[PDB]
């Protein structure tokens, strides 16, 4: 099934857009995605929770 | 240092090309993700495409 690649591309693309991450946080999410791409939906939700809590 | 800097910088430059559409931005970002050493060629290609899709 395509859910795996589809979910991985979504996580990479959205984390790239999250405005309230810093570069070290963004790159840490990117490296986790490379290390375990099966976790991409959870990593996206971590990144988005984190991005929302860091909003101005 | 940063094992993801070349992807992160080029990906940020891809998505800000205002005349590319969403499927195009997504395809260059996934090419960079898989092949960050091609970042300068992929950016050149993305920029060429962007300016060919401007109204002028």
Numbering used by the authors:
A (entry chain A): 2 to 57
B (entry chain B): 3 to 58
Q: What do the study authors state?
A:
First, the binding preferences of the two highest affinity pairs from the LL1 library, LL1.c1 (LIFFK/FILF) and LL1.c2 (LILFK/FIVM), are nearly completely orthogonal, so we focused on investigating specificity-determining positions of the two variants. The two mutants differ by only three amino acid positions (positions 17A, 31B, and 32B) but have virtually no cross-reactivity with each other. Z-A sequences of LL1.c1 and LL1.c2 bind to their own Z-B sequence 500-fold stronger than when mixed with the other’s Z-B sequence. Thus, the mutant LL1.c6 (LILFK/FIVF) can be a “bridging” intermediate to help explain the structural evolution of orthogonality through cross-reactivity. Comparing structures of LL1.c2 and LL1.c6 revealed that the single mutation Met32BPhe in LL1.c6 induced a noticeable geometric change by forming an enhanced hydrophobic cluster within the binding interface (Leu9A, Leu13A, Lys35A, Phe5B, Phe32B, and Trp35B). Due to the rotation of Trp35B and Trp35B-centered hydrophobic packing induced by Phe32B, the N-terminal end of helix 1 and C-terminal end of helix 2 of Z-A tilted 17° closer to Z-B. Furthermore, the compensatory relationship between position 17A and position 31B is clearly revealed from the structures of LL1.c1 and LL1.c2. Taken together, the synergistic effects of the geometric change and compensatory mutations found from these three specificity-determining positions resulted in biased specificities of the two high-affinity variants evolved from the same library. We also followed a single mutational three-step evolutionary trajectory from LILFK/FIVM to LIFFK/FILF which are the two high affinity orthogonal pairs from LL1 library showing similar thermodynamic trends. For example, A-LILFK has more Z-B binding partners (B=77) than A-LIFFK (B=15) from the LL1 library, and A-LVLF (B=53) and A-VFLV (B=42) are also more cross-reactive than A-IVFF (B=3) from LL2 library sequence data.
We adopted the Z domain of staphylococcal protein A and its affibody binder dimer complex as a model system. We next generated libraries at the interface of a weakly associating dimer (Z+ ZSPA-1) with micromolar affinity to determine if we could affinity-mature the interface by coevolution. To clarify these inter-residue co-variations discovered from the sequence data, we determined crystal structures of 10 coevolved pairs that spanned a range of cross-reactivities and orthogonalities (5 from LL1 and 5 from LL2). From the structures, we could verify clear compensatory changes between the residues showing the most significant covariations (13A-9B / 17A-31B) in both LL1 and LL2 library mutants.
